[PDB]
Structure 1
């Protein structure tokens, strides 16, 4: 966990390949009701940054190109911008479901 799991996480981040399209991790998440609500709750700056990064990725995958290596999203600089919003939406959905159980 100390030595190579972080190293294997870095190698897997390089190998998965959304960093060379300029995407962050949370841009790659497939939408559900939860993800759409979490995106709807985002502020305007992060929403506009996300949508520009997504359409830049679609432009790059149109031409079958990738970003230059200095413009690849770094593993440490990758911010998890969405997942507190997603965790709050998941928590309130679980609260609604457990109320509907009883």
Structure 2
């Protein structure tokens, strides 16, 4: 039942509500030390786009509004830009931890 899981994933993505604020999935991650290091390694255009998206979301939440439905972040164009940087940061931190174990 792959398409049932996929359509349920689309439903959960629409029901989470951050697509109505223009946000991506990687903007909603909590900025811990690994996530902050992932933002620090970003290229500057992606960093500026992310900062504008957070500012727009905070401005929309201030007025208790949402974007119009055509401006919502669609599921197919939601790019997981922070995944390789976060993956590298987790790999390096686990390597440091396993070196500190021995």
Q: Is this a same-fold pair by TM over 0.5?
A: yes
The Cα of 1:3 is off from its aligned counterpart by 1.8
RMSD: 0.6
Q: Deviations over 1:54-91 (max 9, x none)?
A: 00000000000000000000001100000100010000
User: Aligned partners of 1:97 and 1:6: how far apart in 2?
Assistant: 36
Partner of 2:27: 27
The Cα of 1:45 is off from its aligned counterpart by 0.4
| SS of structure 2 residue aligned to 1:22 | coil
Partner of 1:73: 73
| SS of structure 2 residue aligned to 1:49 | helix
Unaligned runs of 5+ in 2: none
The Cα of 1:20 is off from its aligned counterpart by 0.1
Unaligned runs of 5+ in 1: none
| SS of structure 1 residue aligned to 2:3 | coil
How many equivalent pairs are there?
102
User: Aligned partners of 1:73 and 1:5: how far apart in 2?
Assistant: 20
Q: Give the alignment's TM-score, normalised by structure 2.
A: 0.98
User: Aligned partners of 1:4 and 1:72: how far apart in 2?
Assistant: 23
4+ residue runs over 6 A deviation: none
